[PDB]
Write a protein that binds this ligand. Sequence first.
Ligand SMILES: [Zn+2]
Ligand SMILES: [Zn+2]
Ligand SMILES: [Zn+2]
Ligand SMILES: [Zn+2]
Lengths: 206, 206, 206, 206
Amino acid sequence: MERNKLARQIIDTCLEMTRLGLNQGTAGNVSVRYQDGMLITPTGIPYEKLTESHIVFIDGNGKHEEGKLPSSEWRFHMAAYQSRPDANAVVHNHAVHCTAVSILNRSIPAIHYMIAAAGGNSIPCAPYATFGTRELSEHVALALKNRKATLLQHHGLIACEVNLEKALWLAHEVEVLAQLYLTTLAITDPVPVLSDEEIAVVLEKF
Amino acid sequence: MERNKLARQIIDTCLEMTRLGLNQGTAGNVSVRYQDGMLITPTGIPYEKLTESHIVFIDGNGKHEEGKLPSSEWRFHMAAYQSRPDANAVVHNHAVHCTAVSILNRSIPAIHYMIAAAGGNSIPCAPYATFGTRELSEHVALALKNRKATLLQHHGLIACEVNLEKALWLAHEVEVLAQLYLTTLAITDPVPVLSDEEIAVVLEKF
Amino acid sequence: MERNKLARQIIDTCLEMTRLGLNQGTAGNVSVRYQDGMLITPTGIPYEKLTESHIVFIDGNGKHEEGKLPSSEWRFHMAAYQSRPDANAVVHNHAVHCTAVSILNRSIPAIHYMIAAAGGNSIPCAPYATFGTRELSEHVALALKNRKATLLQHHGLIACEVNLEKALWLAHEVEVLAQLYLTTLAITDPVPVLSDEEIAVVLEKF
Amino acid sequence: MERNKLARQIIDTCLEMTRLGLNQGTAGNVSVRYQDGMLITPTGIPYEKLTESHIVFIDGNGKHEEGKLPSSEWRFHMAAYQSRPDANAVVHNHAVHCTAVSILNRSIPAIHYMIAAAGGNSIPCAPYATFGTRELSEHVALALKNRKATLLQHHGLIACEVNLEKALWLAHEVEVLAQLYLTTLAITDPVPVLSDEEIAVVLEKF
Ligand SMILES: [Zn+2]
Ligand SMILES: [Zn+2]
Ligand SMILES: [Zn+2]
Ligand SMILES: [Zn+2]
């Protein structure tokens, strides 16, 4: 659990995210909980030029290391951490299907049993607020209180978990649920869903 | 036909399934008929960390090897084997197009002549039941009686064949038929189909 | 222009076709004009196991080399050759978008100027006939008289050109036109097209 | 900033464009501002056969190097350069989503905040004119006056920036916005957009 090991994983997650196609228009950012704050990807540097030494440390006060610019979207990573004590890694991206559902400003209902992976019977969509602002941070914090992933209106997705591996895995799964919802919605509205009882069983089961 | 050779193929099938994009949200599982039961992928371990020694043997009684956890979805692999004596390999996944059609709870009609590859003029959709349960197992067994592949409502796909190569090939083909059906359905409903006589000829021909 | 060189290109075309994603459900077949007939891919062997020695020679009489099974779809490759004297290579596949348009049984109208690459203001859709039959062969021959590519109802695509490189290139381009047509048709019907005069200029220009 | 270094980047951009899937039906062309004109990809040669020595120099007068054929679409690259003094690289392609929106002849409205990357609250669609003509050149020049990217009706996309890296990045981003617009439009019309004030803030913020 040396900083550099955490720094490598973050980078490995960026590359993998792109591999899975979640990172289009190279807009994602990834962070891990560290000391009294977090380690996050910097702004500007395209993921393939990323070296361990580029990862930026931001403390609990919001002050980042001297001479390094953290991601322009860092404020809501800090909001995720303070909203979910159990969260140790955060993955943000603008995956296409997730983003299309967020433009429609709809939550993703229980169309598949795997919806329970985020903690409940849905993936909410937090209201729009300009990126990098405290108001956007509040919307995210409120959305993550009872869910591990949320869509952001006219923007994209935030998923948090206990480690980068699961966080990435969750982000990917929400993208699949997003694609499933858009594909069926184009055929029929509303889309058939599993009842709350049924999701209650799957949750207990997980 | 040593266990380890069968163990490698299972792994090669998982990797290939992912390559083809059938394994998104890393939820598939694969098994082969072996001795009095089957060899199946374990739960938990992400496919890229899979080694021959991870594959789990489950006997005809449902008892699995000590210290190894089989896939959480193993019960319906055993149901496939007991429902189709001729089946020697089973491929399960949550491919997106197949899953979208299963959410609509529709069977795939004869929109393409290749539909005959599964044994008839359609790919059925078995009713929803919580994963890992005996009730889901019954639904699958009934669906596979006269077909080699079936969709599972709000869930995904199961395809069985004489070996892993053909099983994987069939799974892939159903995913293509699923995509063809969703794409045309968004334009026109119902989608034009080939008559039963016509499918009767193609079957005799295959 | 040794047989083995032509045999390698055919194989390189199969691999490339798959690379581009035109070969899903591994159903394509490729041929080149040779001596008094053609060299074609065999049936059964999955493209990655293909070696030069697997390619089958079929003469003008329809008799193929002893001990080798040509593609099950060879008859319409021979029809293409006799219908278009200028054709030296034939590419057949079941690309998804092309196939979806063929299920709707519609020709692709002039929605993009590149439609002229196939020779006119459209990509026709030849009527359905059981695969491997002489009746299907007639439908194809008639469709290829004034076009270099045609869709086959409830089936797929056939594209022919002066060499494998251009044939593959044309097949790919028709798949793009197919995707463009399905995507816009889901929004508006009919889809806006370029006038015949306009296509007359582009043709003269090509 | 030797010619050969600029020649390599152009080639690296073609390969990367294809990698991202923006170059389907191999129809794109790329140029950089150089001396009194530009360096552009040649016509005919498929990108994988491209060597530095193939890149063609065209002067401000429209005269290209002896014995080398520049891209058939070079005239609008020269129009981009004379319309946007600040433009140093131009990327043109026929990406599928961009092209589908251009067939509908619609501009892409502010459905996502990243729309500001092209300079305003939209991505316009310039009217159709036969490729390679001066009339098409005029349409493009007018469209690029206040935007860095534009769709071309029944044709594709042109994006310009300060260097190849950003130009490619912009082209990619417009393709994502195009896909987001088509996907949501198939569900609801009109698609929800962010207000002009909101885009005014994001622009100031960028
Ligand atoms: Zn963002
Ligand atoms: Zn499952
Ligand atoms: Zn065929
Ligand atoms: Zn063009």
